[PDB]
Amino acid sequence: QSALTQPASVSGSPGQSITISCTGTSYDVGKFDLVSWYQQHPGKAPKYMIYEVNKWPSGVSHRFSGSKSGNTASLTISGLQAEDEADYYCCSFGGSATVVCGGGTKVTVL
Amino acid sequence: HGIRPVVSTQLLLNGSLAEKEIVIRSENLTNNAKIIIVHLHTPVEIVCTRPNNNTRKSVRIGPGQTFYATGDIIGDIKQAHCNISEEKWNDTLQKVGIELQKHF
Amino acid sequence: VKNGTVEEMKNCSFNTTTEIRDKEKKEYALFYKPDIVPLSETNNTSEYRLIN
Amino acid sequence: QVQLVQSGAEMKNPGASVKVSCAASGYTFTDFYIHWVRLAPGQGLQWMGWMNPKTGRTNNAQNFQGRVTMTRDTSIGTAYMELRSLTSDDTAVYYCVTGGWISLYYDSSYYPNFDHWGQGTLVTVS
Ligand SMILES: *[C@@H]1O[C@H](CO)[C@@H](O[C@@H]2O[C@H](CO)[C@@H](O[C@@H]3O[C@H](CO[C@H]4O[C@H](CO[C@H]5O[C@H](CO)[C@@H](O)[C@H](O)[C@@H]5O[C@H]5O[C@H](CO)[C@@H](O)[C@H](O)[C@@H]5O)[C@@H](O)[C@H](O[C@H]5O[C@H](CO)[C@@H](O)[C@H](O)[C@@H]5O[C@H]5O[C@H](CO)[C@@H](O)[C@H](O)[C@@H]5O)[C@@H]4O)[C@@H](O)[C@H](O[C@H]4O[C@H](CO)[C@@H](O)[C@H](O)[C@@H]4O[C@H]4O[C@H](CO)[C@@H](O)[C@H](O)[C@@H]4O[C@H]4O[C@H](CO)[C@@H](O)[C@H](O)[C@@H]4O)[C@@H]3O)[C@H](O)[C@H]2NC(C)=O)[C@H](O)[C@H]1NC(C)=O
Ligand SMILES: *[C@@H]1O[C@H](CO)[C@@H](O[C@@H]2O[C@H](CO)[C@@H](O[C@@H]3O[C@H](CO)[C@@H](O)[C@H](O[C@H]4O[C@H](CO)[C@@H](O)[C@H](O)[C@@H]4O[C@H]4O[C@H](CO)[C@@H](O)[C@H](O)[C@@H]4O[C@H]4O[C@H](CO)[C@@H](O)[C@H](O)[C@@H]4O)[C@@H]3O)[C@H](O)[C@H]2NC(C)=O)[C@H](O)[C@H]1NC(C)=O
Ligand SMILES: *[C@@H]1O[C@H](CO)[C@@H](O[C@@H]2O[C@H](CO)[C@@H](O[C@@H]3O[C@H](CO)[C@@H](O)[C@H](O[C@H]4O[C@H](CO)[C@@H](O)[C@H](O)[C@@H]4O[C@H]4O[C@H](CO)[C@@H](O)[C@H](O)[C@@H]4O[C@H]4O[C@H](CO)[C@@H](O)[C@H](O)[C@@H]4O)[C@@H]3O)[C@H](O)[C@H]2NC(C)=O)[C@H](O)[C@H]1NC(C)=O
């Protein structure tokens, strides 16, 4: 499509893990593995969850995890809670030193 | 031996190694003008790099032949450099010290 | 851009004889500073020569 | 300890330019890059440019190339970004984000570690 391909739907329930995928071109995120994921509550700045596909920063819960293979990189939420009602944005190395970010996935307690 | 035709001025790169001990070689150590070669038992790893991301421009100069030159630096400007593991370099330099002591 | 320990190069623009041997165009290329020397006693700090 | 306090809502008409500023504290401002990202409604995160507060080099995504310029001053410790040729679609929230750590030896501009985020400014057009 444009920028980074990303879903826009929910496929799980409370207590269940959910996996979300991200994709660009092979010149994009598939090159280096420089990836990060962010979490935005409504009316708040996105918080900083995952970086370099599989690492996370201090203060973040251990629930979030990720992986990549080829041109696809993915974020995994483990055991959804009511705090997970948010939008999740993929961002990665964008080619020609640029950085790009995706459309964003809504998540709920469906 | 598969001699390396290596171009290197102050250090010897990817060269051969001595079998049992660090070695020193010189035509006449009495002279201050003569070069002194040092040959190591184990190698000291060196890594160099350009962090600058050059793009190869293709200028045409007269009949068909091309002249290649650096285009834009697609990326942030950074320092080209080299690295050596500090403790291993210190060990190798002190061992060349013991081998220099045998002559001094 | 501020100078320092960054190894800044010089963006030098110059005329070339294109494939049309008796015709020319302006062309630009970036050269490292050691490759470049100020021109001559007819001094102009904005004009340079290759070190050859 | 980290905070990037920003300007207010700079509502402006099309054709003009909008200049946002984010003042940094906590981090030693010269050490960390500043990236910029935009939340265009409907669209997701949209990334504009990075800038090296220590050097001054900048780049932009191809959507924004030639359209965005940036500046700062390290003594006060405040960062600026200005967008030219403003239009209706630019109605969005601008966010000033920092990281990774600047080094002279390996490039870390594109490393997308948006460690800390400012509270935002609501740019509206018009
Ligand atoms: C050649 O050679 C060369 C050399 O010789 C090289 O170069 C190099 O390289 C390398 C590699 O890479 C690099 O590294 C890098 O580094 C960076 C930096 O670091 C540093 O720093 C920091 C800061 O500091 C500051 O601050 C503080 C407080 O905090 C203070 O105190 C101090 O002082 C400082 O200050 C400043 O200012 C001042 C003024 O005056 C000055 O002086 C100074 O100097 C400065 O400037 C720190 O922090 C660090 O530390 C840390 O780390 C380390 C390492 O790791 C360690 O050791 C330590 O310990 C620490 O740790 C941590 O962690 C842990 C864990 O466990 C904990 O526990 C603790 O607590 C802590 O926290 C140092 O010191 C850095 O940054 C980097 O890393 C990063 O990034 C990367 C990329 O991206 C990644 O991968 C990783 O992982 C990381 O990440 C992280 O971080 C970031 C930022 O930083 C972010 O973004 C992310 O997200 C993450 O986050 C996390 O963490 C953080 C912290 O950091 C936190 O906050 C959060 O929350 C989370 O958690 C790296 O490491 C280096 O740099 C270089 N060098 C130079 C000089 O540049 C080259 O390369 C070669 N080449 C070749 C080719 O080879
Ligand atoms: C160090 O320097 C080197 C050299 O500069 C860097 O490597 C270079 O990196 C370039 C990427 O920035 C790469 O360029 C690519 O060139 C190919 C042509 O061979 C071109 O097709 C690529 O453009 C597509 O992909 C990029 C992402 O990589 C997209 O941003 C771009 O829009 C293009 O995708 C569009 O078209 C596709 C095909 O139709 C669609 O499937 C896709 O969805 C997308 O569609 C949108 O955009 C359209 C406009 O483009 C629009 O009309 C449409 O409606 C959609 O909205 C890309 O330009 C160089 O090949 C590569 N060179 C080498 C030698 O590696 C290297 O990264 C630098 N190092 C670092 C660390 O950065
Ligand atoms: C090494 O040196 C060589 C030269 O020897 C460098 O190559 C040259 O690099 C120049 C800069 O990139 C490049 O100039 C550009 O050429 C394009 C051709 O399409 C031209 O359109 C550009 O014109 C814009 O920029 C100049 C300033 O550079 C402005 O004075 C001019 O008004 C233009 O700005 C307006 O148009 C832009 C779109 O083109 C808009 O985005 C911009 O906002 C602005 O808008 C005005 O109107 C708006 C209302 O519509 C209003 O809101 C706004 O405020 C403005 O009023 C520019 O001239 C040369 O072509 C290029 N030459 C060659 C041979 O390559 C090379 O980059 C150097 N390399 C390095 C690494 O340093």
CATH number of the domain at D52, please.
2.60.40.10
Residue A74 pairs in a beta bridge with: A21, A67
D74 touches chain C (CB under 8 A): no
Residue whose structure tokens are 């700062």? D72
Residue B70, SS3 per DSSP: strand
Query: Which residue is it, tokens 């960054």?
Result: C6
Question: Rounded to whole angstroms, how far apart are CA atoms B2 and B16?
Answer: 9
- Residue D39's closest CA among B44, B86, A103, A96? A103
Residue-number span of the structural domain to which D69 is assigned: 3-123
Mutating to test ligand 1, I would choose from A48, A51, A91 the residue with most ligand atoms within 8 A of its C-beta, which is A51
Q: H or E stretch including B24?
A: strand B23-25
- A32 touches ligand 2 (CB under 6 Å): no
| Size of chain B in residues | 104
Total of domains in chain A: 1
**Is residue A34, in this structure, part of any structural domain at all?**
yes
Chain position carrying tokens 């001699």: B3
Taken in order B82, B87, B92, B98, is the CA torsion positive or negative?
Answer: positive
Whether A101 contacts A46, CB under 8 Å? no
- State if residue A1 touches ligand 1 by the CB under 6 angstroms criterion: no
The single residue listed with the structure tokens 């220590």 is D54
**CATH code for the domain in which residue A42 is found:** 2.60.40.10
Q: Is residue A94 part of a domain?
A: yes
Where b means 16+ CB within 10 Å and e means fewer, B47-77 reads eeeebbeeeebebeeeeeeeeebbeebebbb
The one-letter code for the residue type at B28 is: N
Q: Name the experiment that determined this structure.
A: cryo-EM
CB A24 within 8 A of CB A92: yes
Q: How many other C-beta atoms lie within 10 A of the C-beta of residue D119?
A: 14
A102 and D45 in contact (C-beta within 8 Å)?
Answer: yes
Ligand 2 atom closest to A5 (CA)? 43
Does residue D103 belong to the interface with chain B, where contact is any CB pair within 8 Å?
yes
Burial class (CB in 10 A: 0-12, 13-18, 19+), A62: exposed
The DSSP bridge pattern shows strands C36-38 and B46-49 to be: unpaired
Residue B93, φ and ψ in degrees, nearest 5: -70, -40
Out of B64, B71, B73, the one facing C19 most closely (by C-beta) is: B64
Which of D35, D45, D59 faces A104 most closely, judged by CB atoms? D45
Three-state secondary structure readout of chain D: CCEEEECCCCCCCCCCCEEEEEEEECCCCCCEEEEEEEECCCCCEEEEEEECCCCCCEEECCCCCCCEEEEEECCCCEEEEEECCCCHHHCEEEEEEEEEECCCCCCCCCCCCCCEECCCEEECCC
Residues of B in contact with D57 (CB under 8 A): 76-77
Mutate to test the pocket of ligand 2, among A27, A98, A99 (most ligand atoms within 8 A of CB): A27
Count of domains forming chain D: 1
CB count within 10 Å of CB A104 equals 22
Residues B83 and B47 sit within 8 Å (Cβ to Cβ)? yes
Residue A98 domain-assigned? Answer: yes
Q: Which residues of B touch C21 (CB under 8 A)?
A: 62-63
What is d(CA D45, CA A37) in angstroms, rounded to the nearest whole number?
Answer: 11
Give the Å distances, CA to CA, from D45 to A26, A82, A89, C28, D112: 21, 23, 7, 36, 13
Cβ neighbours for B38, distance < 8 A, ≥ 6 positions apart: B22, B23, B24, B25, B96, B99
Cβ–Cβ under 8 Å, residues D97 and D35: yes
Q: In whole angstroms, give the CA distance from residue A86 to residue A46.
A: 9
Helix (H) / strand (E) containing B23: strand B23-25
- Could you tell me if A51 and A36 are in contact, meaning their C-beta atoms sit under 8 angstroms apart? yes
Q: Is B45 exposed, middle or buried (0-12, 13-18, 19+ CB in 10 A)?
A: exposed
Distance, in Å, from the CA atom of D71 to the CA atom of D19, rounded to the nearest integer, reads 10
Is residue D35 within 8 A of residue A73, CB to CB? The reply is: no
Q: Which helix (H) or strand (E) holds B89?
A: helix B86-101
Residues in chain C: 52
Give the torsion sign (CA, B57, B62, B65, B67): negative
DSSP code for B90: H
Contacts of D63 (CB under 8 A, 6+ apart): D46
CA D94 – CA D20 distance, rounded (Å): 8
Measure the CA–CA gap between D55 and D30, rounded to whole angstroms.
Answer: 9
The 3-state DSSP class for residue A22 equals strand
Residue A1 lies in a domain: no
Q: Is the CB of A14 under 6 A from ligand 1?
A: no
